[PDB]
């Protein structure tokens, strides 16, 4: 009899966002890999990180990250900043399903709530605070 209290979402929050990674690797190969990697490393989460459309920021050398579940989103920002040699004054924003995730969440929490059907979490990054601008 209790209502499910549905959490509000931003207007732009959209599932199944486009990533070049997903265009370049067939779904079932991604899914098979994601299942396997979750079993092999259960306290890590597999993450794809890609530059958002229209972003003006350096590209990462590598898209696939195997991340300790307890690492925070904030700690992950700092890791990515270093990987792309951001300057102190440079901005960095992450997006999951078009929405900036909470800096204080763990990567495991983010994964739990937002992983896709292939068992990966997808994060886009940008110099801008709105995905795709």
Swiss-Prot record:
Any one biological process term the GO annotation gives: regulation of Rac protein signal transduction
UniProt-annotated stretches for the region Interaction with GABRG2: 52-84
Q: Does the keyword Cytoplasm apply?
A: yes
Lipid-modified sites (Phosphatidylserine amidated glycine): 132
In this UniProt entry, which residues carry a covalently attached lipid of the kind Phosphatidylethanolamine amidated glycine?
Answer: 132
Of the GO CC terms on this record, one is: Golgi membrane
Report the subcellular localization.
Cytoplasmic vesicle, Autophagosome membrane; Endomembrane system; Cytoplasm, Cytoskeleton; Golgi apparatus membrane
Q: Is Lipoprotein one of the keywords UniProt gives this record? A: yes
Q: Where is this region: Interaction with beta-tubulin?
A: 17-38
What are the site positions for Interaction with LIR (LC3 nteracting Region) motif of ATG3? 33, 44
Post-translational modifications: The precursor molecule is cleaved by ATG4 (ATG4A, ATG4B, ATG4C or ATG4D) to expose the glycine at the C-terminus and form the cytosolic form, GABARAP-I. The processed form is then activated by APG7L/ATG7, transferred to ATG3 and conjugated to phosphatidylethanolamine (PE) phospholipid to form the membrane-bound form, GABARAP-II. During non-canonical autophagy, the processed form is conjugated to phosphatidylserine (PS) phospholipid. ATG4 proteins also mediate the delipidation of PE-conjugated forms.
Q: What's the effect of swapping residue 41 to H?
A: No effect on WDFY3-binding. Impaired WDFY3-binding, but no effect on SQSTM1-binding
Tell me what happens on changing residue 40 to Q: No effect on WDFY3-binding. Impaired WDFY3-binding, but no effect on SQSTM1-binding
Q: What is its main location?
A: membrane
Stored PANTHER family: MICROTUBULE-ASSOCIATED PROTEINS 1A/1B LIGHT CHAIN 3-RELATED (PTHR10969)
Its quaternary organisation is:
Interacts with GPHN and NSF. Interacts with ATG7, ATG13. Interacts with ATG3. Interacts with alpha- and beta-tubulin. Interacts with GABRG2. Interacts with RB1CC1. Interacts with ULK1. Interacts with CALR. Interacts with DDX47. Interacts with TP53INP1 and TP53INP2. Interacts with TBC1D5 and TBC1D25. Directly interacts with SQSTM1. Interacts with MAPK15. Interacts with TECPR2. Interacts with PCM1. Interacts with TRIM5 and TRIM21. Interacts with MEFV. Interacts with KIF21B. Interacts with WDFY3; this interaction is required for WDFY3 recruitment to MAP1LC3B-positive p62/SQSTM1 bodies.
Which protein family is named in the record? Belongs to the ATG8 family.
* Protein name stated in the entry: Gamma-aminobutyric acid receptor-associated protein
Q: What is the phylogenetic placement of the source species in the record?
A: Eukaryota, Metazoa, Chordata, Craniata, Vertebrata
């Amino acid at each position: 009899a209790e209502f499910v209290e549905v959490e509000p979402e931003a207007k732009q929050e959209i599932g199944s966002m486009k990533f070049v990674y997903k265009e370049e690797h067939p779904f079932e190969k991604r899914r098979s890999e994601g299942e396997k990697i979750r079993k092999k490393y259960p306290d890590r989460v597999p993450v794809i990180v890609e530059k958002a459309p229209k972003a003006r920021i350096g590209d990462l050398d590598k898209k696939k990250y195997l991340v300790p579940s307890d690492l925070t989103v904030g700690q992950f920002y700092f890791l990515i900043r270093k990987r792309i040699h951001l300057r102190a004054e440079d901005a960095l924003f992450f997006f999951v399903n078009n929405v900036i995730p909470p800096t204080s969440a763990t990567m495991g929490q983010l994964y739990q709530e937002h992983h896709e059907e292939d068992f990966f979490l997808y994060i886009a990054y940008s110099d801008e605070s709105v995905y795709g601008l």
